Design a protein around this ligand. Structure first.
Ligand SMILES: *[C@@H]1O[C@H](CO)[C@@H](O[C@@H]2O[C@H](CO)[C@@H](O)[C@H](O)[C@H]2NC(C)=O)[C@H](O)[C@H]1NC(C)=O
Ligand SMILES: *[C@@H]1O[C@H](CO)[C@@H](O)[C@H](O)[C@H]1NC(C)=O
Ligand SMILES: *[C@@H]1O[C@H](CO)[C@@H](O)[C@H](O)[C@H]1NC(C)=O
Ligand SMILES: [Zn+2]
Lengths: 194, 592
């Protein structure tokens, strides 16, 4: 059995820019275990059908988990742009996989404030499909050469989330997992149930 | 390499930090309002100080981006909404002096007492001016108040005016009046451009059409008060300032028992009908939510029923006990209200929920644009809801009035009169006070003729005569809360105009055939999507375009106001035949 339980029922998820990636290979993939993790805010599969997932086999199933706001859940989709899928985690155009997303207010919200989840806001250029950036360099906005200090035309790229339970439904913490299937010429070792 | 993208990045960073700092400040303020303690007050003060420091630092940092290079309209508007400094333009010494003068005036107004009984402003004076009908019992209190508070605030107000003029000139303005009229300044296309100096030409123009109705109402009130005041009212004279149901005369609602068209048919009250059915605060809020959803507005958030304090706490918490609609941010909308099962609270619940529905509309706009079009717009969206929820047709649909009841003419006339005593009677006083403050700040009125010109305008605009002579030693304008404490007062006239404009625009869109005051926007999804077109813009567009999106006009219009009281206007014109509509500006109660 593939470790799908340790991806959706984890204890602490990573940030959006440092999205946690896990490779799933050499194991029977039971696609029926995805359910039972609460009514999902989103269960959108691109290029495949959520029903016939047990009727095929892929070489590798990459699982990318990250926490984002509620209004930014729609930005995790091929083609769409915004503030999340431009400098933190961009999806390929011809993406054949499944994006699941569910609220996690009870687990990832503190009364004082859960400032542990960070997100990149400023960057020189947009990212590429399946690219990670963990740099903490000052964003040189203007022509003034920044010297590691913050101020005018020198802003910090990584900001923090003010997750609190008093938020509404669009700013609460939402955990999003992305399962991307790979079909290289290598022999398939990840099949469904029997 | 262009400054446009740099300004965009700066605004993005400012909004990202403000959506957290202002949220923390609002949360601290709410925690203070929940349980008023010494620690919560300190936390709220620290949060407000941090927010103000951040805002002034960003404003000092934002002034390095002139609006001439910014081509994008929304970016230019966001930069303009932040470059405005305000009181920080003055030096440290002048700012400290102005703050000390403001605090001293606020302390004098809050700790004012009139004794020859010995009471204060709110406990005894308000009740006497509202309920008591004796001539001397009101005259002595009025004279004592306007002789103590006026003479104690005059020397401070004389320097306050100069300090405010200096602050205005320091912010590239001319006078304090022009600074207060800067909120109605719009920018955009050739038709969507409004100027500050253009407002003065409209507020007067809008006053000419409401003059005959106000004259008829004043004549009717005078004829009705002649009975209770036989030897103190002239048939062709003005009314004393202490016989208006209030210390200043802002609202004439206290004169309803003395000025009633038909006493044998009182107004409609649903208090007992609501108590019989066993309703409560949560039921009132659910009915208000159903009313707001029926017209076609978004649904309330789940946190509104959990984190908001809809009822009075029984855990011993001391609240201010007044209605307020708080928008903390990030989808946090709450209502703090001393809600009961009464009818006035039932209408206030629909009034305050309108502000919440407004705040839930422009949430998609940037933080520098999360506000109404002007000071007269935000308070105008919630007021029209009560006008539609307080109709005899809406009360029968909900279940407060039985189906066997029928609308009567005398009851409608009494209701229109009671509404005009509060809505129509406050417009001339507001206009006169604003004109006086504008002409004083502009230096047109010399400092040796403040009281003279004030009482001269009291006779020509409002038609109020003083019962005793008051020389320049007093300062009666400063006796008002909005004048003593720094606050704008022209917003009420614009609100009163815009509420009737919106009411007419939303009633003509639903194809309603009847009186304007008996409209009912319920069961009309077209009246919500048309209003949401303006509520979703907020401050991202000039107020002229926001007003055109609803009513079509790009300026104030008083014709909807005259159509609201048209039956009452005809009734007053028919009843005031055996009288002279108007007043001569020479009669004086103190003179023989
Ligand atoms: C009365 O006011 C006090 C403020 O001192 C409240 O105590 C706070 O309660 C909130 C919510 O539980 C928390 O911040 C802390 O537990 C308290 N803060 C501090 C600084 O002690 C108290 O909750 C209020 N009473 C009620 C019934 O709410
Ligand atoms: C997740 O794990 C916890 C503890 O192991 C368990 O109680 C819970 O039922 C799990 N969730 C699901 C959907 O099985
Ligand atoms: C308004 O709609 C409600 C439910 O949609 C209905 O019960 C009520 O009778 C309607 N009122 C009128 C006047 O049509
Ligand atoms: Zn209010």
């Amino acid at each position: 059995l593939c470790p799908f339980d340790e991806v959706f029922n984890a204890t602490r998820f990573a940030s959006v820019y440092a999205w946690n990636r896990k490779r799933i290979s050499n194991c029977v993939a039971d696609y029926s275990v995805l359910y039972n993790f609460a009514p999902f805010f989103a269960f959108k599969c691109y290029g495949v059908s959520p029903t016939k997932l047990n009727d095929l086999c892929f070489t590798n199933v990459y699982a990318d988990s990250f926490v984002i706001r509620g209004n930014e859940v729609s930005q995790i989709a091929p083609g769409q742009t915004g503030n999340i899928a431009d400098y933190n985690y961009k999806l390929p155009d011809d993406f054949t996989g499944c994006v699941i997303a569910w609220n996690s207010n009870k687990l990832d919200s503190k009364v004082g404030g859960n400032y542990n989840y960070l997100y990149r806001l400023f960057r020189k250029s947009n990212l590429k499909p399946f690219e990670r950036d963990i740099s903490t360099e000052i964003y040189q906005a203007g022509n003034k050469p920044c010297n590691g200090v913050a101020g005018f035309n020198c802003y910090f790229p990584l900001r923090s989330y003010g997750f609190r339970p008093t938020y509404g439904v669009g700013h609460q913490p939402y955990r999003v997992v992305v399962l991307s299937f790979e079909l290289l010429h290598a022999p398939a070792t990840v099949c469904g149930p029997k | 390499s262009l400054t446009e993208e740099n300004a965009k990045t700066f605004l993005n960073n400012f909004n990202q930090e403000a959506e957290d700092l202002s949220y923390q400040s609002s949360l601290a303020s709410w925690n203070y309002n929940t349980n008023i303690t010494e620690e919560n007050a300190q936390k709220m003060s620290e949060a407000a100080a941090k927010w103000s420091a951040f805002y002034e630092e960003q404003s000092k940092t934002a002034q390095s981006f002139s609006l001439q290079e910014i081509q994008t309209p929304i970016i230019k508007r966001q930069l303009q909404a932040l470059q405005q400094s305000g009181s920080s333009a003055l030096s440290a010494d002048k700012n400290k002096q102005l703050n000390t003068i403001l605090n001293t005036m606020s302390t004098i107004y809050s700790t004012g007492k009139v004794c020859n009984e010995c009471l204060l402003l709110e406990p005894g004076l308000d009740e006497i001016m509202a309920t008591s009908t004796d001539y001397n019992s009101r005259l002595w209190a009025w004279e004592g108040w306007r002789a103590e508070v006026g003479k104690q605030l005059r020397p401070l107000y004389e320097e306050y005016v100069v300090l405010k003029n200096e602050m205005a000139r320091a912010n590239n303005y001319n006078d304090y009046g022009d600074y207060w009229r800067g909120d109605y300044e719009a920018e955009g296309a050739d038709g969507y451009n409004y100027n500050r100096n253009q407002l003065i030409e409209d507020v007067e123009r809008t006053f000419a059409e409401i003059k005959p109705l106000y004259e008829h109402l004043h004549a009717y009130v005078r004829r009705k008060l002649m009975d209770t005041y036989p030897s103190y009212i002239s048939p062709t004279g003005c009314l004393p300032a202490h016989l208006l149901g209030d210390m200043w005369g802002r609202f004439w609602t206290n004169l309803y028992p003395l000025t009633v068209p038909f006493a044998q048919k009182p107004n409609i009250d649903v208090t007992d009908a609501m108590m019989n059915q066993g309703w409560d605060a949560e039921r009132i809020f659910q009915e208000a939510e159903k009313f707001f959803v029926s017209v076609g507005l978004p649904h309330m958030t789940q946190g509104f029923w959990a984190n908001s304090m809809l009822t009075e706490p029984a855990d011993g918490r001391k609240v201010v006990c007044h209605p307020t609609a708080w928008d903390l941010g990030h989808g946090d909308f709450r209502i703090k209200m001393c809600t009961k099962v009464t009818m006035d609270n039932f209408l206030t619940a629909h009034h305050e929920m309108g502000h919440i529905q407004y705040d839930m509309a422009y949430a998609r706009q940037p933080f520098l644009l999360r506000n109404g079009a002007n000071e007269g717009f935000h308070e105008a969206v919630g007021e029209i809801m009560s006008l539609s929820a307080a109709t005899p047709k809406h009360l029968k649909s909900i279940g407060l009035l039985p189906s066997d009841f029928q609308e009567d003419s005398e009851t409608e006339i009494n209701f229109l009169l009671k509404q005009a005593l509060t809505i129509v009677g406050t417009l001339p006083f507001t206009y006169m006070l604003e004109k006086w403050r504008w002409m004083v700040f502009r230096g047109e009125i010399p400092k040796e003729q403040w009281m003279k010109k004030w009482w001269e305008m009291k006779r020509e605009i409002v038609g109020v005569v003083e019962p005793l002579p008051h020389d320049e030693t007093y300062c009666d304008p400063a006796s008002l809360f909005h004048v003593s404490n720094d606050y704008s007062f022209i917003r009420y006239y614009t609100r009163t105009i815009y509420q009737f404009q919106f009411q007419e625009a939303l009633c003509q869109a639903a194809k309603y055939n009847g009186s304007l005051h008996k409209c009912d926007i319920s069961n009309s999804t077209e009246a919500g999507q048309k209003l949401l077109k303006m509520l979703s813009l907020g401050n991202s567009e000039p107020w002229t375009k926001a007003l055109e999106n609803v009513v079509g006009a790009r300026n104030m219009d008083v014709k909807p106001l005259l159509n609201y009281f048209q039956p009452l206007f005809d009734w007053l014109k028919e009843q005031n035949r055996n009288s002279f509509v108007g007043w001569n500006t020479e009669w004086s109660p103190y003179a023989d």
